[PDB]
Design a protein around this ligand. Sequence first.
Ligand code: HEC
Length: 107
Amino acid sequence: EFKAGSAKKGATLFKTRCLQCHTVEKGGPHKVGPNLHGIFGRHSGQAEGYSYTDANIKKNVLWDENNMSEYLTNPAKYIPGTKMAFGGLKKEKDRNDLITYLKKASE
Ligand code: HEC
């Protein structure tokens, strides 16, 4: 259950845990994983110009703060077969902080 946290702390988490694989700016490149602009309020597997695993598309989840928190804890548990699956963001406070940042940065 997402609770708004610190966008400042979330930005640092994004830099150290996500940026190696993702950009978030509008128009940013799909460097490894997809650019994340517009991710909230959108179905999984829909970024224009990115070939996802079929698994990520067929999960058929419409992203919100709560299901993204579950996903980020362990992506392969939520979407079996997802590619380049990172290790997960384990602490609830860290997920809350990251999602607080990502909601802003991705809009
Ligand atoms: C590379 C080793 C990654 C790290 C580190 C993180 N992510 Fe990731 N992400 C990666 C890939 C290759 C993909 C696509 C997977 C597929 O099976 O096709 C993803 C996907 C996501 C998604 C879903 C995107 C969508 O449905 O359009 C999100 C929301 C996401 N990633 C977020 C995210 C965040 C916030 C990270 C750090 C905590 C993180 N990613 C790390 C590859 C990699």
